[PDB]
Amino acid sequence: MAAAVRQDLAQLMNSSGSHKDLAGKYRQILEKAIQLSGAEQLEALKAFVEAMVNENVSLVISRQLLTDFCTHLPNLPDSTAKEIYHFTLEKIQPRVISFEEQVASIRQHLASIYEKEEDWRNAAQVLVGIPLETGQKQYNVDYKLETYLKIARLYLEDDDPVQAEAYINRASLLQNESTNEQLQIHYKVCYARVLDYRRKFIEAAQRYNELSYKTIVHESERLEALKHALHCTILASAGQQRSRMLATLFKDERCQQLAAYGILEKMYLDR
Amino acid sequence: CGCQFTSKLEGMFRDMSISNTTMDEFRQHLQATGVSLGGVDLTVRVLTTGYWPTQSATPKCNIPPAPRHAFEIFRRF
Amino acid sequence: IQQETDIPERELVRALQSLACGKPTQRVLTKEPKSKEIENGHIFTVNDQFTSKLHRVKIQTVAAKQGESDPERKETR
Amino acid sequence: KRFEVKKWNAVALWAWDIVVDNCAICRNHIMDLCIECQANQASATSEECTVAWGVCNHAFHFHCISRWLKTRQVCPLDNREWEFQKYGH
Numbered sequence A: 001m002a003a004a005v006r007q008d009l010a011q012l013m014n015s016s017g018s019h020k021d022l023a024g025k026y027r028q029i030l031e032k033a034i035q036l037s038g039a040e041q042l043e044a045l046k047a048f049v050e051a052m053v054n055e056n057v058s059l060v061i062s063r064q065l066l067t068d069f070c071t072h073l074p075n076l077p078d079s080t081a082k083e084i085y086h087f088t089l090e091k092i093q094p095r096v097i098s099f100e101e102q103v104a105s106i107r108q109h110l111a112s113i114y115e116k117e118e119d120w121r122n123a124a125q126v127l128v129g130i131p132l133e134t135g136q137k138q139y140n141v142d143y144k145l146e147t148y149l150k151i152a153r154l155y156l157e158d159d160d161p162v163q164a165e166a167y168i169n170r171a172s173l174l175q176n177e178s179t180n181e182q183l184q185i186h187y188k189v190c191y192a193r194v195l196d197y198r199r200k201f202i203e204a205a206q207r208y209n210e211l212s213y214k215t216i217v218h219e220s221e222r223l224e225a226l227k228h229a230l231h232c233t234i235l236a237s238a239g240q241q242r243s244r245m246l247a248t249l250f251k252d253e254r255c256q257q258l259a260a261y262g263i264l265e266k267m268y269l270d271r
Numbered sequence B: 001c002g003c004q005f006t007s008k009l010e011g012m013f014r015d016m017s018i019s020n021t022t023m024d025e026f027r028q029h030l031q032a033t034g035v036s037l038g039g040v041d042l043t044v045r046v047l048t049t050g051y052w053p054t055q056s057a058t059p060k061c062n063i064p065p066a067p068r069h070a071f072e073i074f075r076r077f
Numbered sequence C: 001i002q003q004e005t006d007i008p009e010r011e012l013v014r015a016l017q018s019l020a021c022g023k024p025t026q027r028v029l030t031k032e033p034k035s036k037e038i039e040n041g042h043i044f045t046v047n048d049q050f051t052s053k054l055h056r057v058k059i060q061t062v063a064a065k066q067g068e069s070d071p072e073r074k075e076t077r
Numbered sequence D: 001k002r003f004e005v006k007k008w009n010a011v012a013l014w015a016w017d018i019v020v021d022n023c024a025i026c027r028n029h030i031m032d033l034c035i036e037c038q039a040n041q042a043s044a045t046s047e048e049c050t051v052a053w054g055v056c057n058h059a060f061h062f063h064c065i066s067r068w069l070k071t072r073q074v075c076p077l078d079n080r081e082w083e084f085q086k087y088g089h
């Protein structure tokens, strides 16, 4: 019955009336399409997306119905609703400058959904597509930080962090603007992870050690971060800076709890 | 003057030079056609922000569809 | 024009009033509520205006007097 | 239609890219210290070594260009005279 839904949308497009009445009628049509299933639901929603992006349709009807469309979609399972995500993302290009909140929401939903199917490759590329630089929709510094942090974390799990270097940067570039301490802590953990990955084992150990003496970080995470500091310190380049870090790590009693406690104990005590 | 605001006037002139070079360069590419979406009469100018002072807030209003395709060609090109 | 356009601030009115408010007998955008101040629920129409038989007729409401007023004069000082 | 657009004379503005992932004077990173400073501590006093921005929108460490500006003065990535437009990022 997707053809009937498309016919109703085409007739409603040429109808004249108040904005509230048209929005309610479009919402009812959207609900009827959602009640469908299989290919019929897919085609009905495809026509709904095509109608919203259409020039004649009001932007208010366009932005909100697409938003209300995006609210019902996470209910539909990990299936045919993702080919329309690529379809809907592709369709938004004439009004991509008019509104980009829905584009960001779809990309955020798609990135997490790709994250579900052990796919940090495509999740990264989709989330890069977000134009955080634009600024007319001033994404709150936390949101830009959260997005850039997610791209770096996705790239870290995929290990192609030539771009994640440039992405931990743009996270850092707007980092000294944000407020959320937990987001800042989540940033420093990811930033220390980036340092650990590339070559900066000595710098990651410094960052991990700085994050080790915190309070809001979970005690298990604090032990894990310190364990990351200990491993990075052992793996770093043997020098004056690394010797000082070994001396610093020979102070924590939760270093002693770790299995590598013996390793640096022989190490710093010159064996 | 020497190495002063005359240099600001230098950049002002460079922008006019780039505007006309891109003008004829875009003329050649609209002649090629083939994949031209908004193939109507366009006279697009290119300037640099380093020397032109703040004109306004540079708003982000909407654009009519036929100019949108014309703008999409130039930005892509 | 303010809800389905994503229009900027008061600068919209100056652009909008250029066709209706303070217009000679060459109006290209007329309205029923004839008044100086701008309302909200006022309808726009169009007039033929045969007096403006000019083929490439232009509405040069902008650049009425290039005079460098004080507010920009003080800030640039 | 009643009104159709025939001509358009829009003006397009553009700005340079920076590729903020590594500066060219020392090749360490845009942040995370320079070759003349190495570690974070050892008489840094909140790390008095930040990123400097020129009028040409290039970015390097403050100390790296300082050693560059004493010998030459020509911003090795362009031929602008490298004015000083920002301090830090």
Ligand SMILES: [Zn+2]
Binding pocket: D022, D023, D024, D025, D026, D027, D028, D029, D030, D034, D060, D061, D064
């Ligand atoms: Zn550098």
Ligand SMILES: [Zn+2]
Binding pocket: D033, D034, D036, D037, D038, D048, D049, D063
């Ligand atoms: Zn330094």
Ligand SMILES: [Zn+2]
Binding pocket: D054, D056, D057, D058, D059, D075, D076, D077, D078, D082
């Ligand atoms: Zn430069």
